[PDB]
mmCIF file with all atom_site columns, C-alpha atoms and ligand atoms in Angstrom:
data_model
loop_
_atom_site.group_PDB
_atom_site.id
_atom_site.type_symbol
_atom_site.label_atom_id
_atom_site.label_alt_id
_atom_site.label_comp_id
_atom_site.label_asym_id
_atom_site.label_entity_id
_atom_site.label_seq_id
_atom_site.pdbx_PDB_ins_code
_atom_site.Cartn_x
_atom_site.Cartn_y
_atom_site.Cartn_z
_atom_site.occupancy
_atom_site.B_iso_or_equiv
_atom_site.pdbx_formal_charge
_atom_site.auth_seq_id
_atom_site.auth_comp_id
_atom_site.auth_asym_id
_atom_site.auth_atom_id
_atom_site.pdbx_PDB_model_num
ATOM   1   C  CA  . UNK A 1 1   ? 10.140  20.771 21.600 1.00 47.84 ? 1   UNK A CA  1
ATOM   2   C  CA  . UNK A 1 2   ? 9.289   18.717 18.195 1.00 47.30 ? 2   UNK A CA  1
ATOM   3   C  CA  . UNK A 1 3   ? 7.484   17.876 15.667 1.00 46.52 ? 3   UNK A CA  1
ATOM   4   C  CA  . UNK A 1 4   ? 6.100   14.339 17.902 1.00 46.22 ? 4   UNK A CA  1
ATOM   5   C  CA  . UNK A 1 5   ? 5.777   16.336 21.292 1.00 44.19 ? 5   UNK A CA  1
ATOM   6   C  CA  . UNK A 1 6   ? 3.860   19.618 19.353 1.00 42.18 ? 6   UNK A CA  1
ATOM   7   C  CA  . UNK A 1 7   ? 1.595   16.394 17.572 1.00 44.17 ? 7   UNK A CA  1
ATOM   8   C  CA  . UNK A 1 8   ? 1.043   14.941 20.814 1.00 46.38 ? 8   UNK A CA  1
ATOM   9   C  CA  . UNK A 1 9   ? -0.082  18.213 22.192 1.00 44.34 ? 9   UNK A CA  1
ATOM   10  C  CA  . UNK A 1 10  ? -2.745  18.478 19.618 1.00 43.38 ? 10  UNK A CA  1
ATOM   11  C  CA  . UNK A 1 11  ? -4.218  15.395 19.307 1.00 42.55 ? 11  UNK A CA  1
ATOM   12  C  CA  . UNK A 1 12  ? -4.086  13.813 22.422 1.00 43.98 ? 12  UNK A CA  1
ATOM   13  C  CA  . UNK A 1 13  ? -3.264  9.816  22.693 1.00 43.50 ? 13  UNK A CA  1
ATOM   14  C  CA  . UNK A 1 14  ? -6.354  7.268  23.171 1.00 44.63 ? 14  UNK A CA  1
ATOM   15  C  CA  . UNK A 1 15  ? -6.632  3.518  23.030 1.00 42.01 ? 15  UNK A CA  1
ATOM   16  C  CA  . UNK A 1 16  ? -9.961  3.010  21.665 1.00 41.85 ? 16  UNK A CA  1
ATOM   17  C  CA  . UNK A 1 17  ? -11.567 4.057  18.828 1.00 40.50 ? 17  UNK A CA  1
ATOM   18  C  CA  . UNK A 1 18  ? -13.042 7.337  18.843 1.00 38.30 ? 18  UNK A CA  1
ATOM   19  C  CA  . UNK A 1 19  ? -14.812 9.992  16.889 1.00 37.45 ? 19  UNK A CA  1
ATOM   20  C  CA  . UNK A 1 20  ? -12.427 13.012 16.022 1.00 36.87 ? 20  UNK A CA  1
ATOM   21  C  CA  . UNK A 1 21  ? -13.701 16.342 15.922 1.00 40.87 ? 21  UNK A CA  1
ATOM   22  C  CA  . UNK A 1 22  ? -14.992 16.088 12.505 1.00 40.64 ? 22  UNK A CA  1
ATOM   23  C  CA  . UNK A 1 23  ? -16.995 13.059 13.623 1.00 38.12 ? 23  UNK A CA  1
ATOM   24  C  CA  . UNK A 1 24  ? -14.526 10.364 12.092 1.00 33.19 ? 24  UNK A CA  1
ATOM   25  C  CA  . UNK A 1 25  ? -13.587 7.059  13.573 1.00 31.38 ? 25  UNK A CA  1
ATOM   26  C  CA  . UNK A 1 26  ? -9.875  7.428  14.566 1.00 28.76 ? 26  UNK A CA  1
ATOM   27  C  CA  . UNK A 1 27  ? -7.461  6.131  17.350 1.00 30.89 ? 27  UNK A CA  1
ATOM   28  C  CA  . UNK A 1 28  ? -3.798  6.723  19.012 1.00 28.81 ? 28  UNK A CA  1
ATOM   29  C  CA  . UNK A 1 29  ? -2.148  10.126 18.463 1.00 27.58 ? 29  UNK A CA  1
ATOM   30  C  CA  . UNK A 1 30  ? -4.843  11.523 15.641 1.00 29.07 ? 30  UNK A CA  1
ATOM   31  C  CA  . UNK A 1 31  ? -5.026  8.328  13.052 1.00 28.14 ? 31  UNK A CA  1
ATOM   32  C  CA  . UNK A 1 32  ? -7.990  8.467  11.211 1.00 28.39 ? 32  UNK A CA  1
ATOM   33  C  CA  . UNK A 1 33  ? -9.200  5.342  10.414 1.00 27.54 ? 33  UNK A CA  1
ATOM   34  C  CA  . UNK A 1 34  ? -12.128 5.980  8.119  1.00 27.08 ? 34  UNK A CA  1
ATOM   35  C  CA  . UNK A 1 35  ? -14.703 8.420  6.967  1.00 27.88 ? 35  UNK A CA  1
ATOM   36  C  CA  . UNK A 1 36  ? -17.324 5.862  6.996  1.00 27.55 ? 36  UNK A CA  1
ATOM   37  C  CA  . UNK A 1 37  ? -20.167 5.948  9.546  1.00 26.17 ? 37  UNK A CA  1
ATOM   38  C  CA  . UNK A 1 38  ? -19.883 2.284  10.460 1.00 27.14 ? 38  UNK A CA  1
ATOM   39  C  CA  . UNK A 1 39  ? -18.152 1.098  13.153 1.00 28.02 ? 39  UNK A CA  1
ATOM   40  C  CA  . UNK A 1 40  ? -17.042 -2.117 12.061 1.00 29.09 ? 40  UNK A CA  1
ATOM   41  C  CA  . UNK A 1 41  ? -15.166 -0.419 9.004  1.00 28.83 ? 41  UNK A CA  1
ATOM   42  C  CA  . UNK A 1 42  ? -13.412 1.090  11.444 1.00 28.84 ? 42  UNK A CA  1
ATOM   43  C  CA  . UNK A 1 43  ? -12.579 -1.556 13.299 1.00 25.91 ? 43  UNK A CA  1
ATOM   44  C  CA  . UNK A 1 44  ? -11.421 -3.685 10.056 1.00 19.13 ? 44  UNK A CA  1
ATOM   45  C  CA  . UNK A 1 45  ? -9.360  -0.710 9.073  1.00 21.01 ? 45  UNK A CA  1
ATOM   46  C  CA  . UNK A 1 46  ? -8.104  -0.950 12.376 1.00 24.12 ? 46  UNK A CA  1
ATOM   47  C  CA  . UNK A 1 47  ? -7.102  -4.697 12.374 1.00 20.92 ? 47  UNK A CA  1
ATOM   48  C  CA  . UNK A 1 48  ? -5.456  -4.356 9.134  1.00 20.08 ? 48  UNK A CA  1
ATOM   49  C  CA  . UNK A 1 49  ? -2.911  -0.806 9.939  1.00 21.04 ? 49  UNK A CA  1
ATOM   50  C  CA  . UNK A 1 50  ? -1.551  -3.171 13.205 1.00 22.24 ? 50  UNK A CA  1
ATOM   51  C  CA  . UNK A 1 51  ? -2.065  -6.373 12.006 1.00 22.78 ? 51  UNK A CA  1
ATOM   52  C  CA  . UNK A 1 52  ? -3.925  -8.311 14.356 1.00 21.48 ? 52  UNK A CA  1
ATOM   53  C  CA  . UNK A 1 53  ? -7.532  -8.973 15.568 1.00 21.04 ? 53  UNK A CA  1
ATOM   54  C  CA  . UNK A 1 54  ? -7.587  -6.135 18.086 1.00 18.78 ? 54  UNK A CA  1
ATOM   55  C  CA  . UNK A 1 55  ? -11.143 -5.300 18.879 1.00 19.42 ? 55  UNK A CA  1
ATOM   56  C  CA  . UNK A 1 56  ? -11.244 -1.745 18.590 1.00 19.75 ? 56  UNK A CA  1
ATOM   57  C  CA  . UNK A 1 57  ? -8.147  -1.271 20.936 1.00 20.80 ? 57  UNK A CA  1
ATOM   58  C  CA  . UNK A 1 58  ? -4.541  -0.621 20.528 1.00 18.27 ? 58  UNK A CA  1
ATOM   59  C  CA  . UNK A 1 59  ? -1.814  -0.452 22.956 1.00 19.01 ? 59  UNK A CA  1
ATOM   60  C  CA  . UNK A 1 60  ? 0.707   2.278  23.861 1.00 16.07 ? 60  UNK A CA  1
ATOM   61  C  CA  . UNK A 1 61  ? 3.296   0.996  21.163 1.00 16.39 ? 61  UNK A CA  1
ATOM   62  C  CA  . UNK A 1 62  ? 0.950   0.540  18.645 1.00 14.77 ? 62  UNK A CA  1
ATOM   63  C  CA  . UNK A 1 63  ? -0.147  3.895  18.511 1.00 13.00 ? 63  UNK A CA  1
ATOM   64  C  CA  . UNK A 1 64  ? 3.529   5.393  18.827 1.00 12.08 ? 64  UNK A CA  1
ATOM   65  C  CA  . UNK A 1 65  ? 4.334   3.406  16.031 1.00 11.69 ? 65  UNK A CA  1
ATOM   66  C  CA  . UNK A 1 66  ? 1.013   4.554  13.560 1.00 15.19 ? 66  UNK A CA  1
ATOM   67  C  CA  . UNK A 1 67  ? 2.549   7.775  14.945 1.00 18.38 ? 67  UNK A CA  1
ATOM   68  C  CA  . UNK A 1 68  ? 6.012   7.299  13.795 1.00 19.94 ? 68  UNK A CA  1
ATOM   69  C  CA  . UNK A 1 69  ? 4.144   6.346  10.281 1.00 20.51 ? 69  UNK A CA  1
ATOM   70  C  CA  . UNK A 1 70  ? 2.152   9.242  9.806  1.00 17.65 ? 70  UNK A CA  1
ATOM   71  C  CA  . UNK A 1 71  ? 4.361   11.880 10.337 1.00 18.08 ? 71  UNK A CA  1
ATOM   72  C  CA  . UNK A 1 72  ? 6.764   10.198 8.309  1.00 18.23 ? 72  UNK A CA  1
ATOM   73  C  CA  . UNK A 1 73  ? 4.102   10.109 5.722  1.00 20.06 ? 73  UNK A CA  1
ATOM   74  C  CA  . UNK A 1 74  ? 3.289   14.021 6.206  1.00 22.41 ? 74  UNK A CA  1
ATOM   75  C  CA  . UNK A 1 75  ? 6.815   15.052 5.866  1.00 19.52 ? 75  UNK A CA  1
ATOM   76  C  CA  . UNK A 1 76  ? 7.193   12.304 3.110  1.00 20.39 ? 76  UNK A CA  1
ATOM   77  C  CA  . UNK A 1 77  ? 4.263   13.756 1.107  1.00 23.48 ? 77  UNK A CA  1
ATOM   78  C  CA  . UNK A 1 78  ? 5.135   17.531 1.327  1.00 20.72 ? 78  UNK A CA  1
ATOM   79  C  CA  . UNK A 1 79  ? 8.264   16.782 -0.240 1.00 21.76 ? 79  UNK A CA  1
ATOM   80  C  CA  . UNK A 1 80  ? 6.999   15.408 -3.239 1.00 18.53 ? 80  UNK A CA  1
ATOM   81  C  CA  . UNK A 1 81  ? 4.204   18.030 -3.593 1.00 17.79 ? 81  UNK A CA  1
ATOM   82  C  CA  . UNK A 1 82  ? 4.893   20.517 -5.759 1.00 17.41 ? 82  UNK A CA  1
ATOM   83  C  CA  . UNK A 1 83  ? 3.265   23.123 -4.074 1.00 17.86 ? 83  UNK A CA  1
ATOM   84  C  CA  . UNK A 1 84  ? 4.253   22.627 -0.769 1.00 20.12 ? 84  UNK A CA  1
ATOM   85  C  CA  . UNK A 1 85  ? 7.942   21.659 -1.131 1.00 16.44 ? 85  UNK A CA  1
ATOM   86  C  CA  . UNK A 1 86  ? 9.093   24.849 -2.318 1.00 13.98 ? 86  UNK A CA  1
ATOM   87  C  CA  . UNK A 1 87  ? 7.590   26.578 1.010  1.00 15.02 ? 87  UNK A CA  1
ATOM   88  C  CA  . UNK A 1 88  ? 8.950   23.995 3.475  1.00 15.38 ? 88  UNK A CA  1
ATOM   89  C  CA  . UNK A 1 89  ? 12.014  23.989 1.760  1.00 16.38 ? 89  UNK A CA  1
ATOM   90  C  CA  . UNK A 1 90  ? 12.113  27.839 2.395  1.00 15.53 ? 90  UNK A CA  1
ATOM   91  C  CA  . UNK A 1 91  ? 11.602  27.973 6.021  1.00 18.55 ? 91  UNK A CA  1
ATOM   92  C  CA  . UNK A 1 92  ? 13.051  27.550 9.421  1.00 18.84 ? 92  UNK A CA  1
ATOM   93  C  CA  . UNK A 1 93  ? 12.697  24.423 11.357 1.00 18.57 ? 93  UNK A CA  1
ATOM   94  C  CA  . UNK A 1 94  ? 10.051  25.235 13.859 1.00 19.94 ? 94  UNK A CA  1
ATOM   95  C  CA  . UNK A 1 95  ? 8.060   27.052 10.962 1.00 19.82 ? 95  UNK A CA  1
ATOM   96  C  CA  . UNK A 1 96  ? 8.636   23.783 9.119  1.00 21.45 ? 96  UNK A CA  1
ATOM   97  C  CA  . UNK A 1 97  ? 7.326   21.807 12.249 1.00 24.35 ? 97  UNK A CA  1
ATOM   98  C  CA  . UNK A 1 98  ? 4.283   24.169 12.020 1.00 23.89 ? 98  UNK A CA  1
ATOM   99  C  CA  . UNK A 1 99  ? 3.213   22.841 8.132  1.00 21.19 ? 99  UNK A CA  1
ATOM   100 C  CA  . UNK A 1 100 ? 3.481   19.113 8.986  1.00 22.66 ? 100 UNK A CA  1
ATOM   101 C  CA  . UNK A 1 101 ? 1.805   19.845 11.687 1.00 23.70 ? 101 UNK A CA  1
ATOM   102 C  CA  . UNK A 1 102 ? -1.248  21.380 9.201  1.00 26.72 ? 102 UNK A CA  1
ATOM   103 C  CA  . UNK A 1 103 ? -0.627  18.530 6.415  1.00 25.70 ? 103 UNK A CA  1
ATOM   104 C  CA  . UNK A 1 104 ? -0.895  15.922 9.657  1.00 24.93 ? 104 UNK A CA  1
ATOM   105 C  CA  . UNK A 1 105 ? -4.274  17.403 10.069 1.00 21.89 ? 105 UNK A CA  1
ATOM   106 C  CA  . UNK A 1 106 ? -5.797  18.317 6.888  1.00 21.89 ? 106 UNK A CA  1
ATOM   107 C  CA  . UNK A 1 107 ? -3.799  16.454 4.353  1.00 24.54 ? 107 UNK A CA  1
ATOM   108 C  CA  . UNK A 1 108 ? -1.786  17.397 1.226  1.00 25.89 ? 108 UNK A CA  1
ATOM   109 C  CA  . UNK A 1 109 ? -4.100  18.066 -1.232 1.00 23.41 ? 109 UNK A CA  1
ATOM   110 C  CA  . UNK A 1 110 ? -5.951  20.240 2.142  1.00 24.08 ? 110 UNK A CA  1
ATOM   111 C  CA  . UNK A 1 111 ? -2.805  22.478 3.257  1.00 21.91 ? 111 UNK A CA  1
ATOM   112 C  CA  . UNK A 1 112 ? -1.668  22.393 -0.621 1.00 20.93 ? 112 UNK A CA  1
ATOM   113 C  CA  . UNK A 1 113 ? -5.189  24.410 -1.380 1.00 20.24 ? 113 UNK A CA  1
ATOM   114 C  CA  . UNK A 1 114 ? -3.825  27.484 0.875  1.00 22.60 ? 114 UNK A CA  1
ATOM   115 C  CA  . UNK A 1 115 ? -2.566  29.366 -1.974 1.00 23.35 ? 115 UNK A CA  1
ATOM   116 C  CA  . UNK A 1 116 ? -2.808  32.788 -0.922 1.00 23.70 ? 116 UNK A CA  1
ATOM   117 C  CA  . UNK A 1 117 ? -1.004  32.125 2.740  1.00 21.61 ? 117 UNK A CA  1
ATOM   118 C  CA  . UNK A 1 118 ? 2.032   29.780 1.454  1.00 20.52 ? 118 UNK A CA  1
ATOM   119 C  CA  . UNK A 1 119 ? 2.627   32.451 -0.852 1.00 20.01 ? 119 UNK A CA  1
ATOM   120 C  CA  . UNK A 1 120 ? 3.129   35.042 2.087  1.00 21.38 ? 120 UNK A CA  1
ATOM   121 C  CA  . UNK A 1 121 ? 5.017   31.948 4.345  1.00 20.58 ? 121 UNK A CA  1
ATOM   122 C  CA  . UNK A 1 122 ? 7.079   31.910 0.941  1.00 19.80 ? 122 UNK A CA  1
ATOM   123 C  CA  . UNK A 1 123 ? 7.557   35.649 1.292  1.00 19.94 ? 123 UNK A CA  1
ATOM   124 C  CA  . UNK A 1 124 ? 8.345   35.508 4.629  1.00 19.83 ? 124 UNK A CA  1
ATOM   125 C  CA  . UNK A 1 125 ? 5.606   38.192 5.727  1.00 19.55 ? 125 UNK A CA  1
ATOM   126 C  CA  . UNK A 1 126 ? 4.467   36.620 8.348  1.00 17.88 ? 126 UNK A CA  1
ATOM   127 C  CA  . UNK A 1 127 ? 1.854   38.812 10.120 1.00 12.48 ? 127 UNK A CA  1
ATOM   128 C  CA  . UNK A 1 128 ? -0.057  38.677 6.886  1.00 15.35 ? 128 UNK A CA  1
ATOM   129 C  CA  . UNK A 1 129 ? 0.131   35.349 6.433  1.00 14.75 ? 129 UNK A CA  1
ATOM   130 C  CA  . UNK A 1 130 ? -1.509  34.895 10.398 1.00 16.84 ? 130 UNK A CA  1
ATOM   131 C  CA  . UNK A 1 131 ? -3.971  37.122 9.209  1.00 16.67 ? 131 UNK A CA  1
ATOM   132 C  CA  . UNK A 1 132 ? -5.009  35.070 5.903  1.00 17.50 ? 132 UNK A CA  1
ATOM   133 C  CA  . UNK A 1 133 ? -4.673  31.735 7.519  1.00 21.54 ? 133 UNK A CA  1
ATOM   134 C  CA  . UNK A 1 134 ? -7.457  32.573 9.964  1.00 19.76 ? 134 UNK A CA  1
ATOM   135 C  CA  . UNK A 1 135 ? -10.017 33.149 7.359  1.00 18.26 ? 135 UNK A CA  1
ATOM   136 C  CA  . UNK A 1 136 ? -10.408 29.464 6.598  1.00 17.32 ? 136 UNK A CA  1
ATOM   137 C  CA  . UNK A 1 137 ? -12.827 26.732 8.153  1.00 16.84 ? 137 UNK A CA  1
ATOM   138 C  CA  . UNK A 1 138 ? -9.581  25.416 9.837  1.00 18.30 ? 138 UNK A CA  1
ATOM   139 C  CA  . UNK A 1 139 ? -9.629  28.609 12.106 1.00 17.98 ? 139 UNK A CA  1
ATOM   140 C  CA  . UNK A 1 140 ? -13.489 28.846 12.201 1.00 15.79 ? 140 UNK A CA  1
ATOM   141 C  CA  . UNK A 1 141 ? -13.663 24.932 13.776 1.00 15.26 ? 141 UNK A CA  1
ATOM   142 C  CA  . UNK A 1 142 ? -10.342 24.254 15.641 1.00 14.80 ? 142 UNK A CA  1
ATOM   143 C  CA  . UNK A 1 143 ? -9.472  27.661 16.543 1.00 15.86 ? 143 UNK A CA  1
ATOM   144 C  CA  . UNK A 1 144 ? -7.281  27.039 19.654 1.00 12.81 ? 144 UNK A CA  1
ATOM   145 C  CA  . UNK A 1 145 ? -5.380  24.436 17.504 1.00 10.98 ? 145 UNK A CA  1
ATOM   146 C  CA  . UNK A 1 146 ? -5.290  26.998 14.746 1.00 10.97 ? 146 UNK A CA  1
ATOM   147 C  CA  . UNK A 1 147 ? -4.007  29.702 17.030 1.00 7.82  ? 147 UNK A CA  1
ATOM   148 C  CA  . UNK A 1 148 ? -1.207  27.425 18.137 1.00 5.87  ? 148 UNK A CA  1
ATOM   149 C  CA  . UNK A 1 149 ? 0.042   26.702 14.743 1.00 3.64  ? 149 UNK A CA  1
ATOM   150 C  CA  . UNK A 1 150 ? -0.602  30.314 13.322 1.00 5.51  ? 150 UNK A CA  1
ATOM   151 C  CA  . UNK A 1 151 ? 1.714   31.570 16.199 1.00 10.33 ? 151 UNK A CA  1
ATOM   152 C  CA  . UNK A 1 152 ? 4.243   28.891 15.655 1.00 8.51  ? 152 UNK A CA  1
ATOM   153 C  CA  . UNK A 1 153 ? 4.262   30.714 11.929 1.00 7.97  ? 153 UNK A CA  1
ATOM   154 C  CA  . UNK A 1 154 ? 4.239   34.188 13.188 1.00 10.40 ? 154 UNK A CA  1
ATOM   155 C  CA  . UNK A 1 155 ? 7.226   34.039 15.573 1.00 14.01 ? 155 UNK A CA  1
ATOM   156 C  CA  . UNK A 1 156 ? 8.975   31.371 14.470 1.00 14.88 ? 156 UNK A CA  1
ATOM   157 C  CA  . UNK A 1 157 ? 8.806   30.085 18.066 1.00 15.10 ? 157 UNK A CA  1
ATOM   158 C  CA  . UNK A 1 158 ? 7.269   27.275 20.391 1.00 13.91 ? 158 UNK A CA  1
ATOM   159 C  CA  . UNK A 1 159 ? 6.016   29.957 22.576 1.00 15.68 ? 159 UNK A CA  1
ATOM   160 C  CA  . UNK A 1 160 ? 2.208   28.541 22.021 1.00 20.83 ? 160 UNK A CA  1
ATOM   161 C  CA  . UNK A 1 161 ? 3.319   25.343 23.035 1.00 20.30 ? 161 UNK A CA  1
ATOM   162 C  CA  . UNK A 1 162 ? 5.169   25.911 26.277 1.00 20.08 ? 162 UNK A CA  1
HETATM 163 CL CL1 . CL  B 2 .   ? -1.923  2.468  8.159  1.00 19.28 ? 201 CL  B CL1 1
HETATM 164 CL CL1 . CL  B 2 .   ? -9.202  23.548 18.865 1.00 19.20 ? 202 CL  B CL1 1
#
């Protein structure tokens, strides 16, 4: 397992544009598009990330490669945060798989806001820190997807992905 395949697990892959979770126009592996309610923003937005009049729809490798763009991004923008590098750079790789995973999600300035439980990941107390990052809307709205990645922190493990 890997970053990609544990990504891929959690959001799925589809060609058209569709609404995530949250209600926002997105397609491929989890690429949000836009947070505006019209359709044809999205579909601009859309034209412009591949670069080409594509009429709502992608194929396979243009989704792999917003993919390959986005995490890059995540990992990319973790490193220059100030809060967050200093916990990535303290744990193990599958616990580091688990915060790009959050930052793919959420975003920086999102994940970043988690004082309290990168403070524990920091510590490396990591039944406490499961226990704080469940008391967030996260949790509350994607809670199998927050289980997953809360478990991936606790054990240090791709046990919830297997
Ligand atoms: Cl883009
Ligand atoms: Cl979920």
């Amino acid at each position: 397992m890997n970053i990609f395949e544990m990504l891929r697990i959690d959001e799925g892959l589809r060609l058209k544009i569709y609404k995530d979770t949250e209600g926002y126009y997105t397609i491929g592996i989890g690429h949000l598009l836009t947070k505006s309610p019209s359709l044809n923003a999205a579909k601009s937005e859309l034209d412009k990330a591949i670069g080409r009049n594509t009429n709502g729809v992608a194929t396979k490798d243009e989704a792999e490669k917003l993919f390959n763009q986005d995490v890059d991004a995540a990992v990319r923008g973790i490193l220059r945060n100030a809060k967050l590098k200093p916990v990535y750079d303290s744990l193990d790789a599958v616990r580091r798989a688990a915060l790009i995973n959050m930052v793919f999600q959420m975003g920086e300035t999102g994940v970043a806001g988690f004082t309290n439980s990168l403070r524990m990941l920091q510590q490396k107390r990591w039944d406490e820190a499961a226990v704080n990052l469940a008391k967030s809307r996260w949790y509350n709205q994607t809670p199998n997807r927050a289980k997953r990645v809360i478990t991936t922190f606790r054990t240090g493990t791709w046990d919830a992905y297997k």
